[PDB]
């Protein structure tokens, strides 16, 4: 609820706010911008509604079914990128929000190691924006694909369970009237020394999420950890990997060569499953015979996603030497611990690292 509120009538000369903005992103990384001159162009979002005439092929509107036209707006002078829709009122708000984005870029990416490379949208004009028009269960967690993204919205906030801002692992939501929300991408979280976060999005009352990203170059030299993988290819793989793709050959090839890396939703099961069986070991001097009907809602309450026997079968397929698959006389699957002690945290850390290494070897040999 504590969001920083600033005025816009005195930051027009750009000489009093840079230090404060740099200081304020150490704890709060969702910015709110008010009182601009867009009080008569912002309510003119009723022009681009019913076009529906061209296919996707990674440019323009991915028109998926009368309910969604996601315009992945490509840039104009870069190679392999050419996209021009009508969008007159959206061109006016794109010009004002792009000047607002370059204004925020010049006032906040100057406090890092490079203050001329990250704003390289001024020269080559590298922009691939997300005009997600939800016109007349929802989509996955969307972080901004650029390095800085300012957007008009209704509420625009949620929180997935992880170690990030508002760390209480619950979906938090605040409502904001007549303003803009700023969120930065993941490449600026690696550029700045760990001061950013992520934020999930969904169907808001102002459903047209016009995400205008900065979108760094095709050949921008990122440091040592990302020298081989450019910003364009990695973020384009993320752009083509989150929604459904059924138009052409290459992003479907990227989806069948990249969506089999979903071991993090099952190997994290291995970061918590032994804990609960050990919790059953320090409380039931019954020799720990477990029942599937009592171990299933325990891990289903520990993890919000669906947990059924396919994960148990996948864990049996990847690591069979640490568990049993022996059935009893009644007809159900039983599984116990082969350790003679209750649990040792060093051996548990070694077993978790060996499970991670075995799944990584399976990911290397499956492709």
């Amino acid at each position: 609820l504590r969001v920083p509120v600033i005025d816009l009538n005195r930051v027009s000369d750009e000489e009093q706010l840079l230090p404060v903005v740099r200081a304020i992103l150490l704890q709060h990384d969702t910015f709110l911008l008010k009182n601009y001159a867009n009080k008569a162009v912002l309510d003119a979002l009723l022009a681009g509604l019913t076009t529906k005439d061209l296919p996707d092929t990674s440019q323009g509107f991915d028109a998926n079914f009368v309910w969604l036209e996601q315009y992945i707006f490509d840039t104009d002078p870069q190679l392999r990128f050419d996209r021009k829709c009508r969008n007159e009122s959206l061109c006016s708000i794109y010009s004002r929000l792009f000047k607002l984005g370059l204004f925020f870029a010049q006032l906040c990416v100057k406090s890092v190691v490079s203050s001329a490379e990250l704003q390289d949208c001024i020269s080559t004009s590298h922009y691939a924006t997300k005009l997600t028009r939800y016109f007349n269960r929802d989509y996955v967690t969307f972080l901004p694909t650029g390095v800085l993204t300012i957007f008009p919205c209704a509420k625009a906030i949620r929180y997935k369970p992880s170690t990030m801002a508002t760390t209480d692992n619950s979906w938090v939501s605040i409502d904001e009237p007549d303003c803009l929300l700023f969120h930065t991408g993941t490449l600026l979280a690696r550029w700045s020394q760990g001061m950013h976060t992520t934020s999930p999005l969904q169907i808001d009352p102002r459903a047209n999420i016009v995400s205008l990203t900065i979108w760094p170059p095709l050949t921008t030299p990122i440091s040592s950890k990302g020298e081989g993988t450019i910003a364009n290819h990695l973020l384009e793989q993320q752009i083509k990997a989150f929604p459904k793709v059924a138009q052409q050959y290459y992003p479907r090839e990227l989806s069948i060569l990249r969506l089999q890396d979903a071991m993090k939703f099952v190997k994290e099961l291995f970061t918590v499953c032994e804990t609960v069986l050990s919790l059953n070991a320090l409380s039931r001097s019954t020799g720990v015979p477990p029942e599937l009907h009592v171990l299933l809602p325990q891990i289903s309450s520990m993890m919000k996603r669906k947990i059924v026997q396919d994960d148990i079968l996948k864990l049996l397929t990847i690591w069979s030497d640490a568990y049993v698959v022996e059935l009893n006389s009644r007809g159900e699957l039983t599984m116990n611990l082969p350790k003679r002690d209750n649990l040792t945290t060093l051996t548990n850390k070694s077993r978790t690292l060996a499970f991670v290494e075995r799944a990584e070897s399976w990911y290397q040999q499956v492709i």
Binding site: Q27, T163, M164, A165, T166, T167, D168, N169, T271, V272, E274, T275, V276, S278, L279, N280, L282, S283, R284, S285, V294, P297, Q298, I299, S300, S301, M302, R305, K306, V308, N342, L343, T344, T345, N348
Partner: protein, 573 residues
């Protein structure tokens, strides 16, 4: 032991390496004393700390508060002047236990249990220490007394060696803050034939944040449960069953299949089960700028001959539904509307408890056979979705927004069709106005009904197309907890046209009028049918079924002389 000293420095290094800085700044700025720690976080970090918390949480809690106060002291100076101790809230317990699984092996350990709170006590005296005055020599002696026994009789003086009368001195004694709530098992998950158990919970340092009559999740230690954390948020739906429910709801008009799946024992007729299904599925509650709360529940009233089945159907509905308790009762009734402020004799005080379903459905059998208290309490709960307690020093307005399914019998057995329902039943009009749907059965004769009814009821007894029962009861909980279908002003104004005909025609031929409550009722019935249809909004033809439901209840609740209204409503039929 000194082993806690190597435990302390381990978790002191853990809080600076994980969200704990944001957690400690939120508890320190809100001048709060509650610190939040998820079990999965430190369990992924160190399973030996989780094993120690599961084995001995009382000695594990002597390290947590100390390291939290040390972290708050080096993060904030002079925090010990205002707050001396800061507790922690152990949440996300994986093994959720029931109240019937509480055994001797679960003693001195952490346990997360679900329940319903009742007879809550706030800041009520608890005893830790005592003193006693020996009257013979007039002397003082004192021991200890906790929270389970009555009191430890002291009968042997120091030098009197007497059996004299002793008096209790608590004028030099300890300071105890006590808030114990009698928690009970929920009726929506109890096995048939068995009775729900009940326990006593101690709340210390978390008073009056709990709501009586609601489902709750409490994580505490077992010894009498000593609660550490409370959660007022809470057979469930899974990922493998949720896709097939949308696939079932999209094909072959499932509203009539749900109606045919409602009564498997008898053939019946759709007028009772249509009202029953729309009352159990319910509507949506809406408010405008924090005020004007509309009731999202639907209270149905059954009437007719004694021979006809009215109790069996209600029992089946209760079994099918979640948090539905068939209270019934006539003479037994006692405290009406389950809400009561009363004195309690265990420790001599005043308490409040809302008896036994805030989100559920309450089932009343033999509605005409009751006293003044249980009629006024249900009239207050039907007028408003809340019961107020304004006595014994306490003022609390608790949730009583539960749906009402009532069954009754007329005076004399026969329905007496040449008279209206107001002269037939002993009840008056404002208690009848809360019930939107008034379903009434009558008598029938020819071989046709004899060929179908007796054969279906003997087929139900000789055995020991519709939707199965398990998928239907899972679909009820899946649709009632995820969607909220609204209405759009595009062509909905046409129902205000037809209400304009339908109101006026009730004055000239009929005696009883139609009001705005019937319009609120048909909008609730249409949104309940849209909820059962699992749509984004209410369709145009859901109001057609809603106006059919209100015509065959209001027109059927009158004399035979409103027979022209049977054909007057045929143009919109």
């Amino acid at each position: 032991p000194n082993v806690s000293r190597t435990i302390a420095r381990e978790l002191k290094s853990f809080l600076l390496e994980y969200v704990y800085g944001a957690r400690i700044r939120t508890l320190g700025e809100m001048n709060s004393e509650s610190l939040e720690v998820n079990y999965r976080h430190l369990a992924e970090s160190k399973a030996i700390l989780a094993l120690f918390l599961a084995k001995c949480p009382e000695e594990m809690l002597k390290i947590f508060d100390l390291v939290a106060m040390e972290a708050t002291e080096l993060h904030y100076p002079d925090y010990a002047r205002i707050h001396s101790e800061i507790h922690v809230r152990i949440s996300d317990f994986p093994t959720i236990y029931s109240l019937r699984e509480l055994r001797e092996s679960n003693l001195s350990s952490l346990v997360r249990v679900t329940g319903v709170v009742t007879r809550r006590t706030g800041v009520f005296p608890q005893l830790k220490y005592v003193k006693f005055n020996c009257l013979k020599c007039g002397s003082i002696l004192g021991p200890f007394f906790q929270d389970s026994n009555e009191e430890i009789r002291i009968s042997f003086c120091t030098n009197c060696k007497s059996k004299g009368p002793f008096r209790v001195n608590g004028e030099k004694t300890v300071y105890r803050n006590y808030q114990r709530v009698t928690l009970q098992e929920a009726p929506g998950t109890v096995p048939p034939g068995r009775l729900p158990r009940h326990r006593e919970v101690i709340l210390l340092a978390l008073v009056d944040v709990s709501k009586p009559g609601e489902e709750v999740e409490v994580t505490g230690i077992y010894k009498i449960i000593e609660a550490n954390s409370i959660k007022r948020r809470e057979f469930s739906w899974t990922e493998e069953e949720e896709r097939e429910f949308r696939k079932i709801s999209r094909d072959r008009g499932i509203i009539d299949k749900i109606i045919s799946s409602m009564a498997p024992s008898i053939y019946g007729h759709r007028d009772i089960k249509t009202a029953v299904a729309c009352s159990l599925f319910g509507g949506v509650p809406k408010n405008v700028n924090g005020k004007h709360s509309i009731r999202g529940d639907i209270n149905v009233l059954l009437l007719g001959d004694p021979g006809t089945a009215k109790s069996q159907i209600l029992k089946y509905v209760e079994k099918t539904a979640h948090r539905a308790v068939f209270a019934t009762g006539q003479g037994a009734s006692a405290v009406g509307l389950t809400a009561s402020v009363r004195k309690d004799p265990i420790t001599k005080e005043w308490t409040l408890e809302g008896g036994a379903a805030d989100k559920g459905v309450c089932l009343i059998d033999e509605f005409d056979k009751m006293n003044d208290q249980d009629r006024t309490s249900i009239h207050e709960a039907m007028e408003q979705q809340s019961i107020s307690i304004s006595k014994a020093g306490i003022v609390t307005t608790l949730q009583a927004r539960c749906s009402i399914i009532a069954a009754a019998n007329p005076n004399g057995g026969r329905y007496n069709s040449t008279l209206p329902l107001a002269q037939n039943v002993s009840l008056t009009e404002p208690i009848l106005s809360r019930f939107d749907i008034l379903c009434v059965v009558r008598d029938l004769v020819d071989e046709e009904a004899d060929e179908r009814l007796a054969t279906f009821v003997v087929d139900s007894h000789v055995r020991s197309s519709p939707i199965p029962q398990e998928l239907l009861m899972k679909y009820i909980h899946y649709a009632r907890t995820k969607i909220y279908p609204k209405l759009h002003q595009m062509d909905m104004d046409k129902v205000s046209r037809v209400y304009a005909d339908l109101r006026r025609e009730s004055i000239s031929t009929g005696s009883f009028p139609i009001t705005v409550r019937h319009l609120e009722s048909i909008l609730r019935i249409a949104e309940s049918f849209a909820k059962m249809r699992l749509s984004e909004f209410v369709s145009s033809y859901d109001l057609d079924r809603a106006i059919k439901v209100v015509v065959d209840s209001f027109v059927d609740a009158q004399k035979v002389s409103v027979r022209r209204q049977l054909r007057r409503s045929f143009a919109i039929y």
